């Protein structure tokens, strides 16, 4: 049969409402334009199909120099296979 909870009624309901406790069970808890271009030329030369993520991770530097200074001699497509590719 069922272990009809022998406790007093008051104590058991304490944790049901706003008990202000949680996470006790871990579960669903969840910059040189020279150097940039030299790498941008390297990015273009090493793999013309160079995505921004493959470049930004390889940038390992301020986001400004890689994305902006390289935007001149490198053409980036948006859709299709060779897209976002500093080719």
């Amino acid at each position: 049969r069922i272990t009809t909870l022998d406790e007093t009624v008051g104590v058991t309901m304490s944790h049901t409402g706003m008990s202000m406790r949680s996470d006790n069970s871990n579960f669903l808890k969840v910059m040189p334009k020279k150097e940039i271009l030299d790498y941008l030329f390297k990015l273009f030369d090493e793999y013309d199909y160079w995505s921004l993520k493959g470049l930004k991770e390889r940038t390992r530097q301020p986001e400004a120099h890689l994305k902006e200074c390289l935007d001149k001699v490198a053409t980036l497509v948006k859709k299709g296979p060779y897209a976002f590719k500093y080719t």
């Binding site: 049901t16 579960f27 808890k29 969840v30």
Partner: protein
């Protein structure tokens, strides 16, 4: 995550308490539960 957001007591509680309070066994089934009759003991 939280249980308390997932588990919603007001589902069961309000469910049973509604199908008793009205006789609507849900609907599709009405008059299942009636007010007890206490005119006299044998009734």
């Amino acid at each position: 995550f939280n249980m308390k957001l997932a588990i919603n007591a007001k589902t069961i509680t309000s469910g049973l308490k509604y199908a008793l309070a009205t006789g609507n066994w849900g609907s599709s089934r009405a008059g299942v539960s009636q007010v007890l009759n206490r005119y006299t003991y044998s009734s």
